[PDB]
Amino acid sequence: MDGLSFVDKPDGYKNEIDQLVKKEFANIKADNSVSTLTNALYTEYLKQRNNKKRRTPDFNDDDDTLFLEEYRRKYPRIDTSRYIPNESSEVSLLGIVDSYLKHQEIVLDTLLPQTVSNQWRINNDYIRQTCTIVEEMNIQQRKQINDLEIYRKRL
Amino acid sequence: MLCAISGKVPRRPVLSPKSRTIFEKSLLEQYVKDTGNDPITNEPLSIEEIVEIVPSAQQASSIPNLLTSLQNEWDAIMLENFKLRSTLDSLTKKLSTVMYERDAAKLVAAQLLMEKNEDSKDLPKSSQQ
Amino acid sequence: MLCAISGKVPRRPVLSPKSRTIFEKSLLEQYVKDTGNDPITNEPLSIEEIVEIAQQASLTESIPNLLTSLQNEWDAIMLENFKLRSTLDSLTKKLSTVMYERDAAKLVAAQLLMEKNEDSKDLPKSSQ
Amino acid sequence: MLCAISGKVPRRPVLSPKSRTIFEKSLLEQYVKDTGNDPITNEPLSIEEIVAQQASLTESIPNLLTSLQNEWDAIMLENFKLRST
Amino acid sequence: EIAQQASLTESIPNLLTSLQNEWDAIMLENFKLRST
């Protein structure tokens, strides 16, 4: 459990440790039918075919075709109507969303600081604990090698 | 499709312009004839205020319900999108804390395998001598 | 600025008072109807408790609103949600490989704590 | 965007659960320190009352479904002008 | 400020071209009443 990351400063011993972990692992061995087609169209990954009067490019083919042509007119009048109320302001409704995107963006870069200051406030505390244990383990190892050589000289 | 005095199906759906409640002409008249007031709120109400025979005039009594049907079928898609992401970042912490505690425990073996070694060769050189 | 259910920008945001999390009006009221609780903190919430609180620039090329815009909204929803279902099954596979190697390592530590501590004891025994 | 108290751009917004209105933290805190209230609606407000899905910007599925409500209702107004005609 | 029953259509790519036929016909039933 206790393994110090700061004070212990090789990639081969990681590869030496990875084999012995593996040698023990070589041993241990809500919607409707809308959910059905949205899965099925994505799995097949094929776009659904679309039919347009303009694409057909057929004029006066018969009687049904004549009805289709009308559809072109009231869409172009409505498009010119939607191009009229877009061209009325045409810069001022677009600029008020650009400032809206600026105030939304700074909040995430505000949240980028509050994590980054707090995550280093975690690592600043553990490193002090990392250096304290290495100090106590050193005096333990210093007293350990002394006793191993004292008892040999005592005998 | 209910009156709010007795509860029968309204065949002449009237309303008082003091409190929004569909009533019946035969009942709400007797309620005004008893006391000069609306039953729902007990405020001032008369007979000439009442909204009489139904509105169909130059209106030509489809199109809208397909738009709300897309509003309803998007709603289950939006609700499935929350808890699916809730399942993702729940175990993404459980993926991250596991692999990091694994690598920290991977260092625990690397210290102890070299501590067994220094205990191994010292006992060899001493027990011979 | 955002909603805490779908990840949208709400036009009619609502605030619950039990957990302060800004969500959309139709998204908060739908959750309160199905399961009678705040979804975020799992506290009790009603429809009458919540407190009611954007400019979208249309493209100049606005039949594009019928054909080209409508399909890709249902295309980008599906191939993201299908991509996400591959992510959820793959991560639980990566969870099962995280948990197995964790138990594989602890049995090494439990086996090596028995090896080193007895060898250092045998160093204390050899002097005698 | 704007504050309901002053009118300047707030650098630390808090939203109160008494009348949800975008106020700056240092202005609304001083306002709650004088009396414990919301200056908009005079509702009882405290300091603690004031406060994983990745998002996209509001661009023209929520906005596309609301677009045709702006389309179809106005064309229904075009029907009424030519019915009364 | 003043009976609803939700429309149960049928038992989704069919409904995409269903909506396209309505907005086509909605413009055609608007356009006939203008020339008339």
Q: Which of E25, D53, B87, D57 is nearest to A97 (CA)?
A: D57
Is-contact C1 C23, C-beta < 8 A?
A: no
Residue with tokens 């405290």: D46
Half-sphere exposure (CA, 13 Å, Cβ side) for A149? 6
Residue E36 Cα to chain centre, angstroms: 22
Using CA coordinates, name the residue in chain A closest to D9: A103
Other Cβ atoms closer than 10 A to E27: 19
* Whether E12 and A34 lie within 8 Å, measured CB to CB: yes
Distance, in angstroms, between E36 CA and closest chain C CA? Answer: 26
Neighbour-count burial for A85-104, b at 16+ CB within 10 Å, e otherwise: ebeeeeeeeeeebeebeeeb
Rg over alpha carbons for chain C, rounded to the nearest Å, is: 28
Q: How far apart are CA A103 and CA D15, in angstroms?
A: 16
Other Cβ atoms closer than 10 A to D71: 15
Is-contact B100 C104, C-beta < 8 A?
A: no
CA distances from D8 to C77, D1, D11, D23, D24 (A): 39, 9, 9, 10, 9
Q: How far apart are CA A4 and CA C13, in angstroms?
A: 48
D69 near B CB under 8 A: yes
Residue with tokens 């191939």: C79
Is-contact C37 C43, C-beta < 8 A?
A: yes
| H or E element, residue C14 | strand C13-15
Q: How far apart are CA A93 and CA A87, in angstroms?
A: 10
* Whether C62 and A54 lie within 8 Å, measured CB to CB: no
What class, spelled out in words, does domain B1-51 have in CATH?
alpha beta
- Bridge partners of B13, per DSSP, are B24
**Structural domain spans, chain A:** 10-154
E12 near B CB under 8 A: yes
Other Cβ atoms closer than 10 A to C80: 12
- Subunit partners of chain E (3 or more CB pairs within 8 A): A, B, C, D
Reading the block at residue C110, the tokens are 């439990």
Resolution (A): 2.5
* Whether C109 and B112 lie within 8 Å, measured CB to CB: yes
Reading the block at residue D71, the tokens are 């389309």
Q: Is B22 helix (H, G, I), strand (E, B) or coil?
A: strand
* Whether B107 and A3 lie within 8 Å, measured CB to CB: yes
Q: Which of residues 66-85 of C touch D (CB under 8 A)?
A: 69-70, 73, 77
Residue with tokens 């739908």: C30
* Whether A32 and B73 lie within 8 Å, measured CB to CB: yes
Q: Which of A152, B12, D37 is nearest to C124 (CA)?
A: A152
